[PDB]
Design a protein around this ligand. Structure first.
Ligand code: ZN
Length: 164
């Protein structure tokens, strides 16, 4: 084996928070190494809507500002990574949970094209809304396997996933 010192790490380095307006990987979202191409908007009255799955994780707060439960509807991959992050958030800050401020968007809040229109993007905070935490939250989102993570706003981190 590689030797002692490459076992279970007793004193791991702290992971690095991302900086305001940083994105990882450091390429455009729609590029192949990140979240790949936009396949087009999903409407409620389509059949790609039926591929979207609802996320009912009790450890995740859904703002659901629209009161439609649309924020819960996402692709399986988006659900998988979001569920992984919900675990790591609680581990990092006890008593704190992951919060989704926007998921699948039916209302065109995101320019002409957006991964929010196809259940492949969430905007997130900590449940305590302590904005000093968000650099680290965005780091946790990277390590949880989101395919692109962008510290878009002082108010949220935007995370997205590849299609399927
Ligand atoms: Zn977003």
């Amino acid at each position: 084996g590689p030797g002692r010192g490459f076992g279970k790490r007793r004193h791991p380095k702290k992971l690095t928070p991302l900086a305001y307006k940083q994105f990882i990987p450091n390429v455009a979202e729609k590029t192949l190494g990140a979240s790949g191409r936009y396949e087009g908007k999903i409407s409620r009255n389509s059949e790609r809507f039926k591929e979207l799955t609802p996320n009912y994780n009790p450890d995740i707060i859904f703002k659901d500002e629209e009161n439609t439960g649309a924020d819960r509807l996402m692709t399986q991959r988006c659900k998988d990574k979001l569920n992984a992050l919900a675990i790591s958030v609680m581990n990092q800050w006890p008593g704190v949970k992951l919060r989704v401020t926007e998921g699948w968007d039916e209302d065109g809040h995101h320019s002409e094209e957006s991964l929010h229109y196809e259940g492949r993007a969430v905007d997130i905070t900590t449940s305590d809304r302590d904005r000093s935490k968000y650099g680290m939250l965005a780091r946790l989102a990277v390590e949880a396997g989101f395919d692109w993570v962008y510290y878009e706003s002082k108010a949220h981190i935007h995370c997205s996933v590849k299609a399927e």
